[PDB]
Design a binder for this molecule. Structure first.
Ligand code: CLA
Ligand code: CLA
Ligand code: CLA
Ligand code: CLA
Ligand code: CLA
Ligand code: CLA
Ligand code: CLA
Ligand code: CLA
Ligand code: CLA
Ligand SMILES: CCCCCCCCCCCCCCCC(=O)OC[C@H](COP(=O)(O)OC[C@@H](O)CO)OC(=O)CCCCCCCCCCCCCCC
Lengths: 165, 73, 63, 144, 741, 80, 39, 73
């Protein structure tokens, strides 16, 4: 398929790797009894391994010649061959949480900046204001775009300190 | 150092006829430390030992020489 | 009476100053013919831990 | 005011001696001599290590560099409130009075002094190095 | 002149008002934060009690409460170890098979795949193999069930709460005066008699009544469930009389001066137990009895409130010769008024004793089945050695602190300290020369051996076959110790340890302890150790003697103890403070102790540890220390390259975590090089550029971000260097000794 | 010898002279500040370059500057 | 109680509580959703 | 002259080694590449470059060395 890779559901090395992991786990399990805590723990780990391999093959991931999955970072290839869940959707998810945290911190700084002692509000966190801004940050992309359109997101050149060149 | 390590390991695995070793161990740093730096230095540090020496002893002396200069720096 | 009013806020125009392009509160303006009569106090300290300095009449702009 | 004259037959503080004393530079290049007046006997700390006892009245000591003499001067002024003074002595016997230069300490302003190495401008008003390039030797833009 | 209990009532009020005010202890930090540097300062001057105020009474009270809080933390740690041994360990299973089941007391939760670390340690358990040696210690004390360990954990928690309450009470309800702290005579009398003597006597009583019969029955083949409980042995005389006939006579032979009747549990057996491999508990009990009597006798030396006894000031003033001037005059006042001087003395002797403990513990294993556990032996020796080295460096640091802050020349006119300061140049010059001589004669031998081996001339090396340098003094001392039980020790059965000579003791197919033979490689490594110790001493002593002044800076004392430099003048005065000398001594201590632990590991795995076969003993590495340790290439190939195979291939097994740490530790160490090879000016300008980026988007904090200080950068670099190197060696040693030991 | 310069921004606070450990700086009369004093460097031949005077200067930017020049016996602070 | 809440509002206490909450949330997410590699 | 005939199984030689510190094993260990004494095996690749541009005999290298020395002078 893409870049000479084969799907994990039809790769021989993938199945051999799964059999290798299950074989070493079963080999470690043969030394214990049947109704003991280590045996139950090993069986739980084996079930987790089976579920993980089944879920990875079910997701349609592309495996290589080593039997391990590969991620598709190109937006066109991901949206064209059903690989948007690898690197596209998590990218936008991180962008939302990253801008979320950044906007919450920026709002807290700008809010405490006009007070009498901002340094005290920086070392001793004002939990009520921080909690209110944390709950209000859900609309961070909308607020950031509206701030950018109004011209209030950036500071002017004359109000920023610079070197003597 | 990173570019030369990459070049040396990829070409070593190509010349040895096993590029899969590099393809499977170049994703984790343990593979770089064991399969490349530890696996390829067995003959180097064996240039001179109590059992004798060979033509590779000068490189072993140079290896320790560089380590000493680095530590002196 | 010459210079900025006491207690006002002015911007520093001295390039080599740590508070260049920064706002500071006016403390006192010397009435003699000294080169730097304006005294400006800043909330943020410099690398030496100083918050006050002396600037000239043209080195400060009202802002 | 008159420049003091070094008295070599001046008693010295009782010190047992140390290894941080004078070296071959005191006999080949120069050394320093610090003298002071003490109102009473008192144990003080030597700048080269050890504790000595300054005698009542005149006290003389020898040091390898000027920093040691000024350090002892500062210690005597700030801990016992005295007025010490020192000279630079050459192997040929020449004595040169150094501090205080005018008899008045330099922390306070005194009449008759002339300011030297003073630039009637600020740091930001200095010229670029390209203007002081190709000179007789390495010259900084602040030297002019 | 009167020793009493002086105290002040309710000096400080218990409130949370100061908890909300950071930096209230210092006048400089009480203003508040303005820059990030302040935050770092808040943690750097937290325990600096002689900087908050100049009152000695306040400093002493704060020290007392800090000691109580520290002991509370230690009790929490001990209670945690006992609780882990009682609920998440296999101690009960390990007691039934102490030669096959690996000790383990930590379990991990089945999350993100870490359950692979729960290796099969034996006895129907899955966990992490511990190396602290708690299983052997609990077996030595007679613990046979998880209930006893659980009760000990509860008692430890109670003791921790009591220590915390004691600290709070002594700081806010009843704070002792300064005269109570200065009763060094009474303090020494109590610490000698009460603390040490009574502790040794109490432990002797427990060993005689619990450890001896329980362990004797364990060594007799009795199952741990069928062994009588300790209180059962402590309640009736029949069981004790059966196990030890002397118990049938009661305490009557003690008062009738017929102590010879107690020759069944108080002997001089010597050597090691052939069943367990550790020291005989009867000998340890007799040892504790003698130690208790000696310390109790020593506890009545100084005068307290009666005429009998000594005055330490009188003894110090009575010691004065012609070559020392006045002598120890003023030393008593120095130690009774400066906590840093006492800290220096205590830290030095404490670290030295810790290293001595490490040596005596690998040589004479006192716990049962301890010598057979190579992992515990190696880890314990390495740990105690590192603690001793760190404490020694701290001793030098506090000596310099005392010399800078608490030293007063008006009370040290012609004493020993003043004369030492007077000839400090001669001291440093001779120590520098001996360091250079030792370095040449210690490192040149290895370089010459590497050259001769590389040049194809093995006959020109410094080895047993070639030119040999045999440690004749150590070999003669070993022979004297081996022959001691026949001429100079008629009442001793065997020697103190098996390392001197004689027959080896092996338990469960593994060599517990065999004689150690020293050759040319041992001579060379011992000279290497001596050279490294001398250099560390040189750096620390130079920082202590030249802390007040020097030929470069005569007013160093005015600059304090911890300052970055005195400017680029005089050619450059970078790292002239005593703090920087401690900073360099830390690196040299790390180098010295690292070579010490490497030598210990190689010698033990090469000529002592190993399995027992039919007609012959095979070691772990095959005895290659007497042939490959005389060259740097041998150390790098046979000891570092060959022995690191276990830590690099540990992935996929229960030791994989070690491999991860082995990589992580290589990171932190290299991370240290970022703070040690650079300066804060570059970082400050880079921070300025980042601040501009923040100011553009109005995200610049009010607290101005400032780069780390020069001293902070050096401290961060040395901390990361030590952590990275120590963790690297820790992972390598633990993974290797657990895989092949 | 090192080059020590005094600029016109000197306020005559006399802190740089007290911080000098080798008696290089002094105070001379002036008419550019309220204190009517100004720092001077007439004995730069003894300056070592410790920059203690720069640390003690409170003006922004500094009024006293030290430039490392030709090294000699007095400038290197050698007792030998 | 005001001083106690102010002490709990400091940077290290808030950082400890926040990181404990975030770490616990991530751990519980990986516990109820084992081995998530894709969406 | 011998490397050009078999450039696959013959190792290039940089220069000879005259070290009085070498013992007998070092002399026979460095004696390789068909030489009569201890020599260093080159890794600079000048053999392949000179062989590709046209050098075939040692006379060509000698003439080139003399010409380059005169040019340097
Ligand atoms: C971050 C840098 C980056 C890089 C290095 C690439 C690289 C690539 N992209 Mg791309 N892409 C990017 C960002 C990037 N993209 C972003 C941010 C978006 C969101 C707008 C897209 C959306 C996108 C689409 C929709 C497509 C690609 C495609 C491609 C591949 C070939 C097209 C090309 O090179 O022109 C640069 C790509 C663009 C300018 C985007 C428009 C698509 C152009 C016009 C190519 C379409 C023509 C045709 C389908 C090509 C296929 C020929 C043949 C194989 C059938 C190529 C490997 C194509 C592909 O291979 O499909 C699987 C494809 O159709 N990308
Ligand atoms: C309000 C918080 C905040 C915000 C909005 C930003 C924003 C920005 N930073 Mg920054 N930074 C922060 C905190 C913040 N930083 C802190 C605390 C540090 C010290 C560790 C740094 C150190 C730092 C460096 C070294 C650099 C940036 C850079 C940048 C810019 C590039 C984007 C980036 O992600 O860089 C990376 C961000 C980080 C490395 C730190 C993120 C730390 C967390 C996630 C931020 C929030 C922490 C705070 C405690 C939460 C607020 C609590 C409040 C609600 C009560 C960007 C404008 C780069 C630049 O120069 O601009 C181009 C750059 O080089 N930052
Ligand atoms: C709940 C009871 C209580 C209360 C309300 C106070 C209140 C006060 N104490 Mg006090 N004290 C207490 C118990 C208490 N103390 C106990 C149990 C001890 C014995 C340890 C002390 C010993 C003590 C001393 C010696 C001093 C005070 C001081 C003070 C005053 C300010 C310092 C401060 O609290 O900052 C808050 C400090 C902290 C939150 C740090 C606590 C750290 C604890 C003790 C150890 C933590 C170990 C940690 C878990 C291990 C680190 C590992 C890390 C990875 C987590 C303040 C009014 C100081 C003073 O009066 O100023 C002159 C003073 O010097 N206390
Ligand atoms: C026989 C009497 C005795 C005993 C047993 C101790 C024991 C101890 N003292 Mg102490 N001391 C004594 C007399 C005694 N002292 C006298 C007479 C003075 C006045 C001159 C002092 C003044 C003094 C100071 C200034 C300090 C100590 C300290 C210590 C502790 C050192 C910690 C350690 O490493 O040991 C081993 C640790 C343990 C064994 C932990 C268990 C603790 C148990 C409960 C023993 C406590 C016994 C002690 C007498 C308290 C009982 C009295 C009762 C009111 C509770 C230790 C527990 C240091 C400290 O404060 O630690 C907090 C310290 O700084 N002592
Ligand atoms: C500090 C260490 C220590 C301790 C605590 C003990 C304790 C004990 N030993 Mg022992 N022993 C020790 C060291 C110790 N030993 C050492 C070092 C040796 C080697 C020389 C021995 C050798 C030894 C032998 C050979 C024997 C003992 C025995 C005993 C037990 C009885 C003691 C006895 O004979 O009567 C002594 C009488 C007393 C101790 C008086 C007790 C005082 C009580 C507690 C007063 C309580 C009064 C209170 C106010 C009551 C009011 C309560 C209220 C609720 C009503 C006893 C539990 C005997 C034994 O166990 O038999 C098997 C025994 O034969 N020991
Ligand atoms: C009985 C032991 C003891 C005691 C009571 C003291 C007491 C003191 N020391 Mg000292 N010291 C000791 C041992 C001791 N030291 C040892 C063993 C060393 C060698 C390393 C030193 C070296 C030393 C230096 C160089 C200095 C002091 C200083 C001080 C004083 C200020 C307190 C302080 O350090 O600031 C606060 C304490 C801290 C900020 C703790 C630092 C935390 C470290 C960096 C973390 C350790 C890493 C950890 C083990 C691993 C964690 C892993 C990580 C992933 C979390 C104080 C009186 C300073 C001083 O003289 O004051 C002027 C000083 O500069 N000490
Ligand atoms: C491997 C790197 C290295 C080396 C070789 C040295 C070497 C030395 N250090 Mg040093 N040190 C190092 C790392 C190193 N250090 C690091 C990283 C730090 C930072 C923490 C320090 C910090 C430090 C301090 C604080 C001190 C030293 C001191 C010394 C000297 C001790 C005297 C001695 O050992 O006698 C002999 C010399 C050697 C063993 C060096 C190697 C000599 C070789 C083997 C001899 C070869 C001779 C050869 C024939 C020459 C022919 C040349 C030819 C081309 C013509 C010594 C020269 C101490 C000192 O000043 O001296 C007392 C001192 O106090 N070091
Ligand atoms: C510093 C450690 C050290 C030591 C102890 C030796 C020792 C030796 N080397 Mg060696 N070497 C070393 C380092 C060392 N080397 C290093 C680091 C290298 C690598 C560069 C080499 C490389 C090397 C080579 C290539 C060779 C040797 C050889 C030798 C042997 C003969 C050298 C000789 O005769 O010179 C002569 C020595 C002297 C003229 C002076 C001796 C010093 C005197 C005894 C000290 C006098 C001081 C006295 C106490 C003052 C008293 C005071 C007053 C009262 C009088 C000899 C046993 C040779 C060999 O292999 O032998 C088989 C040889 O071929 N070495
Ligand atoms: C920048 C480097 C990086 C990246 C991109 C990842 C990425 C990932 N890691 Mg990993 N990891 C890293 C560094 C990194 N890690 C490091 C340095 C370590 C060593 C400490 C680890 C150790 C590690 C382990 C042990 C595991 C992972 C796992 C994972 C996967 C878990 C996804 C998840 O949490 O579910 C989804 C998360 C959420 C749904 C939370 C969403 C946030 C809120 C609630 C919703 C907002 C969304 C809009 C993921 C793809 C796990 C795995 O299974 O691998 C496949 C796992 O077991 N990582
Ligand atoms: C070892 C000799 C100890 C020396 C010794 O203690 O002899 C004894 C000698 C006599 O001292 P006093 O009898 O005056 O000391 C009495 C008072 O200090 C209290 O006892 O002490 C000294 O000589 C101090 C001078 C240092 C001596 C420098 C010799 C350097 C050799 C050290 C090298 C070690 C290897």
């Amino acid at each position: 398929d893409i870049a000479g890779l084969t799907p994990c559901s039809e790769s021989k090395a993938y199945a051999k790797l799964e059999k290798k992991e299950l074989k070493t786990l079963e080999k470690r399990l043969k030394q214990y009894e049947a109704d003991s805590a280590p045996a139950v723990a090993l069986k739980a780990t084996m079930e987790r391994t089976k579920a993980r391999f089944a879920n990875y093959a079910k997701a349609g991931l592309l495996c290589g010649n080593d039997g391990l999955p590969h991620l598709i970072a190109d937006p066109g290839l991901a949206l064209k061959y059903g690989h948007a869940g690898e690197v596209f959707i998590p990218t936008f998810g991180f962008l939302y949480v990253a801008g979320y945290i950044g906007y919450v911190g920026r709002q807290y700084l700008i809010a405490v900046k006009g007070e009498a002692k901002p340094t005290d509000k920086e070392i001793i966190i004002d939990v009520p204001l921080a909690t209110k801004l944390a709950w209000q940050g859900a609309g961070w992309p909308l607020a950031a775009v509206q701030e950018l359109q109004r011209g209030t997101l950036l500071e002017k050149e004359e109000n920023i300190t610079v070197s003597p060149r | 150092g990173w570019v030369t390590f990459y070049w040396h390991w990829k070409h070593l695995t190509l010349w040895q006829g096993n590029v899969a070793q590099f393809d499977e161990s170049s994703t984790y740093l343990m593979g770089w430390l064991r399969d490349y730096l530890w696996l390829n230095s067995s003959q180097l540090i064996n240039g001179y030992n109590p059992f004798g020496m060979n033509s590779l002893s000068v490189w072993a002396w140079t290896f320790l020489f560089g380590h000493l200069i680095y530590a002196t720096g | 009476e010459v210079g900025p009013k006491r207690g006002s806020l002015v911007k520093i125009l001295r390039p080599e100053s740590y508070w260049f392009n920064q706002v500071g509160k006016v403390v006192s303006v010397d009435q003699s013919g000294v080169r730097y009569p304006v005294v400006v106090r800043f909330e943020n300290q410099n690398y030496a831990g100083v918050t006050t300095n002396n600037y000239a009449l043209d080195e400060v702009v009202a802002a | 005011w008159t420049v003091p004259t070094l008295n070599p037959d001046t008693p010295s503080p009782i010190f047992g001696g140390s290894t941080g004393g004078l070296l071959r530079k005191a006999q080949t290049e120069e050394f320093y001599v610090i003298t002071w007046e003490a109102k009473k006997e008192q144990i003080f700390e030597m700048p080269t290590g050890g504790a000595a006892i300054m005698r009542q009245g005149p006290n003389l000591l020898k040091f390898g560099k000027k920093e040691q003499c000024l350090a002892l001067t500062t210690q005597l002024r700030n801990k016992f409130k005295l007025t010490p003074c020192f000279y630079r002595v050459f192997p040929d016997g020449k004595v040169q009075y150094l501090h205080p230069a005018d008899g008045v300490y330099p922390e306070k302003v005194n009449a008759g002094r002339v300011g030297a190495n003073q630039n009637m401008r600020r740091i930001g008003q200095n010229v670029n190095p390209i203007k002081v390039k190709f000179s007789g030797r390495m010259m900084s833009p602040a030297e002019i | 002149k009167k020793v009493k209990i002086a105290v002040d009532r309710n000096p400080v009020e218990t409130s949370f008002e100061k908890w909300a005010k950071p930096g209230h202890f210092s006048r400089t930090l009480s203003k508040g934060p303005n820059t990030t540097t302040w935050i770092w300062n808040l943690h750097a001057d937290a325990h600096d009690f002689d900087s908050h105020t100049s009152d000695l009474e306040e400093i002493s009270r704060k020290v007392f409460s800090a000691h109580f809080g520290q002991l509370g933390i230690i009790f929490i740690w001990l209670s945690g170890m006992y609780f882990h041994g009682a609920r998440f360990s296999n101690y009960e299973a390990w007691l039934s098979d102490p030669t096959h089941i690996k000790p383990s007391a930590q379990v991990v939760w089945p999350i993100v795949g870490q359950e692979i670390l729960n290796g099969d340690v034996g006895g129907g358990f899955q966990g992490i193999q511990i190396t602290s040696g708690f299983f052997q210690l609990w077996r030595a004390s007679g613990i046979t069930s998880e209930l006893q360990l659980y009760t000990t954990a509860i008692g430890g928690l109670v003791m921790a709460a009591a220590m915390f309450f004691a600290g709070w009470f002594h700081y806010h309800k009843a704070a002792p005066k300064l005269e109570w702290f200065q009763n060094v005579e009474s303090m020494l009398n109590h610490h000698l008699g009460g603390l040490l003597g009574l502790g040794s006597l109490a432990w002797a009583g427990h060993q005689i009544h619990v450890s001896l019969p329980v362990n004797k029955l364990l060594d007799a083949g009795v199952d741990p469930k069928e062994i009588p409980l300790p209180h059962d042995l402590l309640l009736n005389r029949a069981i004790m009389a059966d196990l030890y006939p002397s118990f049938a006579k009661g305490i009557a032979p003690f008062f009738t001066l017929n102590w010879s009747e107690y020759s069944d549990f108080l002997t001089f057996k010597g050597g090691l137990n052939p069943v367990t491999g550790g020291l005989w508990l009867s000998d340890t009990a007799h040892h504790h009895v003698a130690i208790a009597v000696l310390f109790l006798v020593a506890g009545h030396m100084y005068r307290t409130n009666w005429g009998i006894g000594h005055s330490m000031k009188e003894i110090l003033e009575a010691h004065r010769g012609p070559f020392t001037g006045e002598g120890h005059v003023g030393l008593y006042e120095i130690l009774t008024t400066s906590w840093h001087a006492q800290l220096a003395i205590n830290l030095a002797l404490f670290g030295s004793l810790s290293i001595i403990v490490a040596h005596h513990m690998y040589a004479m294993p006192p716990y049962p089945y301890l010598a057979t556990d190579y992992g515990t032996q190696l880890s314990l020796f390495t740990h105690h050695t590192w603690i001793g080295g760190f404490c020694i460096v701290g001793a030098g640091a506090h000596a310099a602190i005392f010399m800078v802050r608490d030293y007063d020349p008006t009370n040290n006119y012609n004493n020993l300290l003043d004369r030492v300061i007077r000839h400090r140049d001669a001291i440093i010059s001779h120590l520098n020369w001996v360091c250079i001589f030792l370095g040449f004669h210690s490192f040149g031998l290895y370089i010459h051996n590497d050259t001769m081996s590389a040049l194809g001339r093995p006959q020109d090396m410094f080895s047993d076959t070639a030119i040999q340098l045999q440690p004749v003094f150590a070999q003669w001392i070993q022979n004297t110790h081996f022959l001691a039980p026949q001429l100079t020790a008629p009442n001793a059965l065997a020697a103190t340890s098996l390392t001197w000579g004689g027959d080896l003791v092996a338990v469960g197919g593994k060599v517990a302890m065999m004689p150690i033979s020293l050759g040319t490689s041992d001579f060379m490594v011992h000279h290497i150790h001596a050279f490294t110790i001398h250099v560390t001493v040189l750096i620390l002593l130079k920082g202590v003697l030249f802390a007040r002044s020097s030929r470069l800076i005569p007013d160093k004392a005015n600059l304090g103890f911890r300052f970055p430099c005195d400017g680029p003048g005089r050619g450059g005065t970078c790292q002239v403070s005593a703090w920087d000398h401690v900073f360099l001594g830390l690196f040299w201590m790390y180098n010295s102790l690292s070579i010490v632990i490497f030598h210990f590991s190689w010698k033990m795995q090469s000529d002592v540890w190993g399995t027992v076969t039919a007609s012959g003993v095979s070691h772990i590495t095959g005895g290659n220390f007497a042939q490959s340790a005389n060259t740097i290439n041998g150390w790098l190939r046979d000891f570092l390259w060959a022995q690191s195979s276990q830590v690099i291939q540990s992935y996929g097994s229960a030791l994989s975590a070690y491999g991860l740490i082995f990589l992580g530790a290589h990171f932190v160490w290299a991370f240290s090089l970022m703070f040690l090879f650079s300066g804060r000016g570059y970082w400050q300008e880079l921070i300025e550029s980042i601040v501009w980026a923040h100011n553009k988007l109005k995200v610049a904090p009010a607290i101005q971000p400032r780069a780390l200080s020069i001293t902070q950068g050096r401290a961060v670099g040395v901390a990361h260097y030590l952590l990275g190197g120590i963790a690297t060696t820790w992972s390598f040693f633990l993974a290797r000794i657990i895989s092949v030991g | 010898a090192h080059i020590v310069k005094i600029y016109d921004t000197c306020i005559g606070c006399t802190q740089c002279v007290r911080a000098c450990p080798l008696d290089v700086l002094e105070m001379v009369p002036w008419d550019g500040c309220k204190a009517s004093q100004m720092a001077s460097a007439p004995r730069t031949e003894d300056c070592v370059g410790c920059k203690r005077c720069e640390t003690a200067c409170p003006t922004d930017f500094l009024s006293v500057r030290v430039y490392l020049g030709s090294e000699s016996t007095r400038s290197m602070g050698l007792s030998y | 109680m005001k001083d106690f809440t102010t002490y709990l509002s400091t940077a290290p206490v808030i950082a400890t509580i926040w990181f404990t909450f975030t770490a616990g949330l991530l751990i519980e997410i990986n516990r109820y959703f084992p081995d998530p590699l894709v969406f | 002259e011998q490397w050009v005939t078999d450039p696959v199984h013959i190792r290039p030689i940089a220069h000879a080694i005259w070290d009085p510190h070498f013992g007998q094993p070092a002399v026979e260990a460095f004696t390789r590449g068909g030489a009569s004494g201890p020599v260093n095996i080159s890794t600079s690749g000048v053999y392949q470059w000179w062989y590709t541009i046209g050098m075939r005999t040692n006379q060509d290298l000698y003439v080139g060395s003399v010409f380059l020395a005169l040019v340097s002078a």
